Design a protein around this nucleic acid. Structure first.
Lengths: 210, 209
DNA sequence: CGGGAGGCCCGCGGGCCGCCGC
DNA sequence: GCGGCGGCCCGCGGGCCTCCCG
């Protein structure tokens, strides 16, 4: 403890970065668009976007919005370097990892298990933030989400989830699993999930705004 | 697609964003130290670190590391503003929330619950990131953890847990709990958990190079 | 039988609900 | 009945574990 509490001295303002962020976003937007997952595997961590062009009833708008360019993301994720929680890269260095390609791939697999979504109707964009750049990954991801408010980011939860595992079978599958059954593990959960009607209604709210 | 695939076309080269973290990390280091919890409540979202100065056997070494200054944190966390998960911020009708303060206190309180740690032996530092700097919170925390590798984040897991609740009761009591009862809810967990000897043996290792 | 990738655990803490004191 | 405080759900995904191919 120290006498004289003064809140002003704990606040961190440094505007320098906003322009760094808008430079990243700017760049992201012009990166080539590939199918899901990309035709080759690659090393790197970074950020990515998923785009829909199919006609599943609830999402048909995207085939309209995205008809002429990949304009609106359904989802935007990030693959951060290994070591975010414990930072234990302490005596086993690398092996330049490839965690971005891996998530993107994982997400492709999950879609491919759904009954009502066709992986052929998704594409992506992704950026690799190198060496020291890796520090941006999160911040850019937030900006992208602030700009597009992608549906699986701002209305429908659970796309990005891993299995809860035994020990957590009792919890509820996510909204994302209720409307898109089924990853196996989603079907082993006994927990009371949302009711399809509420999730569908949230989705319609999302597509009302001009 | 339509293209070739040219990994190179997706690469973002940047070097100065790292300097921003440096600035934030160094600034954090400078901020006034307060006990746990801080003497007053305050509004803001951001990052905080916790400090030990006590003599509970296993952690006694901190009383020698932090003897002269608040050097090495035992745990580093974050608190992000309300509606961050679905990017509906103080829209309508906040940003005047006080989530940083509030989590610092839930932390104090968990500690107060243990039978073998004394709250007075803990101090803290915190940084508030204001609007539009809150995008950064996540990252500063990660750097702070990379730099200080704080025992609880990197070795004695669990302090971070809120109650897992029903639905998750079959998981294993966390390392942290198994050395620091008694959070009510940890007793409800039924998974096969790690052994005190190996947890203590890991703490001994933390202080050995 | 070691390195990599994907499987299967729980960590951190966000969000929302309910109880409480205004 | 509000909003502040706690408590109890789970999102979101990191990391070790495994299984397999050398």
């Amino acid at each position: 403890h120290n006498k004289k509490f003064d809140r002003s001295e704990h606040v961190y303002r440094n505007d320098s970065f906003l322009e760094l962020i808008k430079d990243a976003v700017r760049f992201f937007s012009g990166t080539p668009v590939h199918s899901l997952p990309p035709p080759e595997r690659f090393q790197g961590a970074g950020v990515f976007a998923l785009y829909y062009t199919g006609h599943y009833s609830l999402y048909d708008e995207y085939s309209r919005i995205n008809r002429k360019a990949y304009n609106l993301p359904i989802y935007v994720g990030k693959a951060v370097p290994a070591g975010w929680r414990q930072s234990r890269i302490s005596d086993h260095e690398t092996r330049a990892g490839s965690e971005l390609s891996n998530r993107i791939r994982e997400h492709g697999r999950n879609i491919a298990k759904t009954s009502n979504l066709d992986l052929c109707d998704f594409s992506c964009r992704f950026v690799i933030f190198e060496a020291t750049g890796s520090d941006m990954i999160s911040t850019v991801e937030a900006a992208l989400i602030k700009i597009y408010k992608p549906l699986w980011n701002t209305v429908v939860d659970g796309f990005g989830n891993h299995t809860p595992g035994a020990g957590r079978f009792a919890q509820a599958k996510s909204d994302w699993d209720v409307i898109h059954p089924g990853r196996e593990w989603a079907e082993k959960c006994t927990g009371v999930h949302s009711e399809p009607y509420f999730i569908e209604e949230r989705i319609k709210q999302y597509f009302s705004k001009s």
